[PDB]
Amino acid sequence: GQDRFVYTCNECKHHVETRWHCTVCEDYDLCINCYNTKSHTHKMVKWGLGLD
Ligand SMILES: [Zn+2]
Ligand SMILES: [Zn+2]
C-alpha cells in the first residue's frame, strides 16, 4: 500500500511513513522492524520519508 508520504506494513496491516516493499508480491509491505525480523528475502524496493 502507498500514499505520497504514507505506506503500510503488510505484517502489522497498519500505516508506516517508511516501508520495505515486495516487487514480487502484490505491493506487499513491511515496516523496518518487520523487515528486520520477518526476513522477507524477495526482490523488494524501499520508500522512506521519516525513519529510513
Ligand atoms: Zn514478498
Ligand atoms: Zn511491521
Enumerate residues with CB within 5 Å of ligand 2 (an ion).
9, 11-12, 31, 34
Looking at domain 1-52, its CATH class is alpha beta
Using alpha carbons, select from 37, 44, 3 the residue that is nearest to residue 16. Answer: 3
Ligand located closest to 25 CA = 1
Output the nine-digit C-alpha cell for 2. Answer: 502507498
Q: Where are the domains of the chain?
A: 1-52
The pairs formed by 22-26 with CB atoms below 8 angstroms and a separation of 24 or more are none
| Residues 29 and 7 sit within 8 Å (Cβ to Cβ) | yes
Using alpha carbons, select from 51, 49, 43, 52 the residue that is nearest to residue 5. Answer: 49
- Residue position matching grid coordinates 505484517: 11
d(CA 7, CA 47): 8
| Residues 18 and 27 sit within 8 Å (Cβ to Cβ) | no
Amino acid at 31: C
Please indicate the experimental technique that yielded this structure: NMR
Distance, CA 50 to ligand 1 centroid (Å)? 23
Distance, CA 30 to ligand 1 centroid (Å)? 9
Q: Supply the Cα-derived Rg of the chain in whole angstroms.
A: 10
- What is the DSSP-derived secondary structure letter of residue 30? E
